[PDB]
Amino acid sequence: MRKPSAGDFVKSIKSFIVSFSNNAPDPEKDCAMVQEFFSKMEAAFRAHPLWSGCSEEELDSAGDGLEKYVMTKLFTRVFASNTEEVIADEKLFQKMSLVQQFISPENLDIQPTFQNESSWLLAQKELQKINMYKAPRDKLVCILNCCKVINNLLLNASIASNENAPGADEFLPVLIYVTIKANPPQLHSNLLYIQRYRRESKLVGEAAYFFTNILSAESFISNIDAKSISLDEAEFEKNMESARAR
Amino acid sequence: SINAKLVLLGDVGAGKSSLVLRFVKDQFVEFQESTIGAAFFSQTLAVNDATVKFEIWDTAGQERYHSLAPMYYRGAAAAIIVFDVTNQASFERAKKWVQELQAQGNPNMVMALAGNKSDLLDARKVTAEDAQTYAQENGLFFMETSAKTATNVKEIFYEIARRLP
Ligand SMILES: Nc1nc2c(ncn2[C@@H]2O[C@H](COP(=O)(O)OP(=O)(O)O)[C@@H](O)[C@H]2O)c(=O)[nH]1
Structure with a gap:
């Protein structure tokens, strides 16, 4: 994701993170938004002309990498909140x-x-x-x-x-x-x-x-x-x- | 290509672990000693030019854990309610699982009443009549099984797989 090609993927995740603050905290709403985001970014990893590309295992690891990055950023807002x-x-x-x-x-x-x-x-x-x-x-x-x-x-x-x-x-x-x-x-x-x-x-x-x-x-x-x-x-x-x- | 969640219900000592171990590993404690636990198994079966992938969930049968069971049988496509034919209280308990499954889940579930340790003669306390009658009146089927001799072990799972809506 530090690669110059990944630029807009990084901007996409970052704008999810900031646009997540804009709504008042709600667990059942928040988790719907996160899963939808995960589904969409997952789809965007496999469908990407650049990423077609990785083995299934590697694509699965990128999903977990995405999960870890995003949830770490969203932790205080969504955990025991x-x-x-x-x-x-x-x-x-x-x-x-x-x-x-x-x-x-x-x-x-x-x-x-x-x-x-x-x-x-x-x-x-x-x-x-x-x-x-x-x-x-x-x-x-x-x-x-x-x-x-x-x-x-x-x-x-x-x-x-x-x-x-x-x-x-x-x-x-x-x-x-x-x-x-x-x-x-x-x-x-x-x-x-x-x-x-x-x-x-x-x-x-x-x-x-x-x-x-x-x-x-x-x-x-x-x-x-x-x-x-x-x-x-x-x-x-x-x-x-x-x-x-x- | 047909996934099915199957719950095993019944009180301790009925033969839940033995039944699924026979079915999955073709093993019984008296002939082949232990290798893996038996609380969870994935097993595939061929039925009429198709495939059923059973996900098999064991439940704790002790009374103090009874109220937790809905968490386990939630969304199950099927359930085997096991009782020991040599133990009348096991059968009383199997009957309660059936009523609960009918009351509190889930209309198109395939339930199988398994009457296990059928190989045991002197000690038999639950008639095939009572078990059969009960099953016939409650929309489910009764099968006598034996994990020890393998009788009707493969068959009871086929017969559940056959009935999957
Ligand atoms: N003779 C005979 N014994 C069995 C049969 N199934 C289980 N057992 C034995 O009865 C005991 C309880 O069975 P188990 O599978 O552990 O029951 P669970 O607690 O419901 O999982 C064990 O010692 C088994 O070896 C059977 O079909 N025939």
Whole structure:
């Protein structure tokens, strides 16, 4: 894009970025404009007499390059950019900061046969990298990496305990536990931002499946009470009180 | 060239993982030990001079995760609701998935009621009659399957692929 031929492509992206300020911030409107812009610039990469040209993979990389450049510029305007998203982030952070202190694998129906003794530490850490990145793709990759790590660790546990291959019954509870333990900041806003701004053609397949798992994890976690983690009413509230004290 | 999202629904131990592993990998735990997980699979099938690419989504079957399931079955073209023929509570639960799928999604979904571990005789607790009758009255079909012996595993997916609107 620093090439003298790319001149007007650069002017086209820059004028999108500045003409994005002109309208009052609105998530559902904004993300429509961004995807339309992505679709159009995508089309303009492949159709360009100069670019005909690149392999499919290379064209896909330019799409991600475009996504990263544009979203980095638009980040503060579009990320956690209203009161209800800020409130929801804080509620989720608050709930997890307490629950992580007393939650155990049996609370979520994780069987001792699928125990990991690091408590899937590496997966926790992959998830926490989420606020190291601004591009939706790089945020999503942290999520996908977390999921791939969990899956490989579940596979090892079934090898060691001569069990059947793990499914969603194994994976989801472990993703929930791992998310509670990692408590990544602005998890609500991060998921919404990926869902809204990831190149739409790419939030598909296995990526979409694991993304749906983490959205469902968020939802479960938001709604944790005594019954949903199999603790007595009085035991749960007592656990929450000690958690607030530390 | 025909993409279809297929959800697997059923409670833990019913045989969700076993069914799809048989279908996808031609493997069963007793004969071939583990290699990959089974929560997600893409699988292609040939039907009457065509092709169906199944995207297969597994769901967590425990009760505490029940209210999350609509997120998984949203927009599915199809669902296999699995129960274990040796476990009556699994069948009660399979029936609830069917009513929910009828209430809360999605009119042209192809639902298949799978009655699994059919190879198991002494322990059988759910009659083919109850399962068949139930399916017949609720617009879906019942198939007895066995992941262990491979009986009706390939067939149940073909039979879903056959019915795709
Ligand atoms: N005999 C027999 N056993 C089965 C069959 N399908 C699954 N199983 C076993 O029943 C247990 C639960 O099955 P699984 O696939 O893990 O169920 P899931 O929790 O629903 O995924 C496992 O130990 C399987 O080996 C079958 O068709 N016949």
